[model samples]
Target: HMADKELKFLVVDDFSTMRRIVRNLLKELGFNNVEEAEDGVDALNKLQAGGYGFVISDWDMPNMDGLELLKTIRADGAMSALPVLMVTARAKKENIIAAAQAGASGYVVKPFTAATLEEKLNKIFEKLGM
Candidate 1:
């Protein structure tokens, strides 16, 4: 299993504030290797280039939503098993089901605390034994 602090993470969100918040929270969690993407399209582009161990993405964004990104990641051979933790404002049960069906490693609703993000990240890695 990879160390939490050593793992690289991609944080994708259209909102700069949210992105900054997530990044700072990751830093607080002792994860310093984190990158940002403005939207799902940008995220996919970065994912295609490799080196990322995990993805923290928003569900809604211009030009390809998180669901599409999750599906694309699951479909792509190089990143099929890459862990994805969705952090979004969408709180519907249907959204959670869709994300799970699309192969998301974890889901966290918006207004999440640092503890929530850490817990979800830990849970995802634990499930993957990474």
Candidate 2:
């Protein structure tokens, strides 16, 4: 749909299926460059190498949960400004508030549609200017 953006994405999830789904969705949305990480630890490792434009992460993972990952990123001066969008099944209000407070660029509940993803991405870019 929006696949001409030429953005590099990091898709982090414990489940390969979920990562693939997110990657496919992003690809359909005009973002063709996406790399997947099995967990926050892996994501963080890949991010430490430093080249991705955005991160789409799941909340619950085996090692280093998404919240922890966000905190880690925000606490690190070099990566503090990296854009992170949390996409997870953790849809409670408290979780949402916590995620917002934790510095997520956007939050989306699992089972979300492409439109929802697009809206969140658009709002983030609109607000953050990229």
Candidate 3:
């Protein structure tokens, strides 16, 4: 919730480069309350500890991929409604549909511009009325 003014974020990716990029982008968007995770396992661990509002995840990670992580989050009652934006290199139609079916709040392809990311984030936030 931007409504909260302290809406924390968790960005998960195997690559440190991508994670840094996403974190910096979020900071530029005024979301400084953000953290990083190396993979789905790390993401879930941090999430379980609490206080995470948004998640931007990479699909092709080791130890439970983003789709499986999305499914798990959707299946959990406490945080089932949490917004998860998938950011990945897999731009295939099947992968997109799979992510959609797994309950991702939004999907972004790799090599996406800052403008594209901002648009998607705004779409999800506005749709959630955050």
Candidate 4:
């Protein structure tokens, strides 16, 4: 089992507001050690340290998208079964298909409340069995 408080989160988004929104939600969930990434390239750059406990990424971004980000890290075991959740707006059903296939732990739509985000986290944390 992992220490919830000690679990560092990496929040990636091309939009600064989205990053703050996501990071704030995580803070409400009692997680404060969150870092922000402006884009997937920056995300991968930060990932080099390998201290990832969780990830919250936008679906569309410059350089790399969330799906590709998920695939790249998951494919190489770089994240070592790390949990990633996609935060999308106007998402399509097939998008989930892509997400599921790419190895995302969970995903949620935009304009969601902290409780909703927490609910998504609950399912993934449950699956992580921690």
Candidate 5:
């Protein structure tokens, strides 16, 4: 687990604008050490390199999807506990349940505010006692 301001976050999304928005929102919360991945495969690659404390990902993407990434991270021994926050437009009950069942740490629907992100991040941190 990592602190609110010290965690290195990986933002995964196909859209550059969305990635920028998430990065900016994270920055607003004083969490500026962020990286970007265009899809799940890219994210998995970066995650394999290690040192990522958190992941903010979009549910849908070209190659591997967020759900897959979340499951992959959950299954991996090294990164299984790595908190993954899904930031996506997929706002169905089943989607949320799927993410939760797949071991996602948190989920944020798209068009979210900085306050929401901060609150979710703080909640996760609090749960982790970080």
Candidate 6:
């Protein structure tokens, strides 16, 4: 579905395995140009360097959490329009609302299938017309 637009994704997670899993999933879904980050801080650093189209971040992290990172991105002038997809283990209603309030473009709970990931990406892309 996302074959045309040259999309660059940043996968952020403290767990290397999880980051690999997410990157592989994006690859499986035909997102070839994907990068990995150990945490939100790393993701933000890469984003500041440019060439990234989307962000997939984990909620829990040591230095900076996903919500804070989202806030930072939203607060930034150049990166504010960048789409942020929160891929996290937090499934609570409050977490969802908080992430929404934090300006997350989309949310995906962990232990998700490839279908779910594809669906969320499609929905967000369609919503944003990206």
Return the top candidate by TM-score.
3
- Model 6 misplacement above 4 A: 1-5
Which should have the higher lDDT, number 2 or number 4? 2
Full-model lDDT, candidate 5 = 0.90
Query: What's model 5's lDDT at 12?
Result: 95
lDDT top scorer: 3
lDDT of each: 0.89, 0.87, 0.92, 0.84, 0.90, 0.87
Candidate 2 structure quality by residue, lDDT tens digits, 1-130 = 1223767789999998889888888878778888999888999899899877889999999878999999899899888988899999997899999999999999999889888988998888878766
Q: After superposition, how far is residue 62 of candidate 3 from its true place, in Å?
A: 0.7
Per-residue lDDT of 1-130 in model 4, one digit per residue for the tens? 3638878899998998999898888888788989999877788889877787888889899888888888887876556488888898847889988898888889899988888998998898888875
Supply the global lDDT for candidate 3.
0.92
Q: List, residue by residue over 48-87, the lDDT tens digit for candidate 3.
A: 9999999999999999899989999999988999999999
Q: Each prediction's TM-score against the native?
A: 0.95, 0.93, 0.96, 0.93, 0.95, 0.93
Q: Which stretches of candidate 5 lie over 4 Å from their true place?
A: none
Segments in model 1 whose C-alpha atoms lie over 4 Å from true places: none
Q: What is the lDDT of candidate 6?
A: 0.87
Candidate 4 error regions (>4 Å): 1-3
**Candidate 3 Cα deviation (angstroms), residue 8:** 0.3
Instruction: List CA RMSD, all candidates.
Output: 1.1, 2.6, 1.0, 1.3, 1.0, 1.9
Query: Candidate 6 versus the native: TM-score?
Result: 0.93
Off by over 4 Å in 2: 1-4
Error at 71, model 5, angstroms: 0.3
Model 6: number of backbone collisions: 0
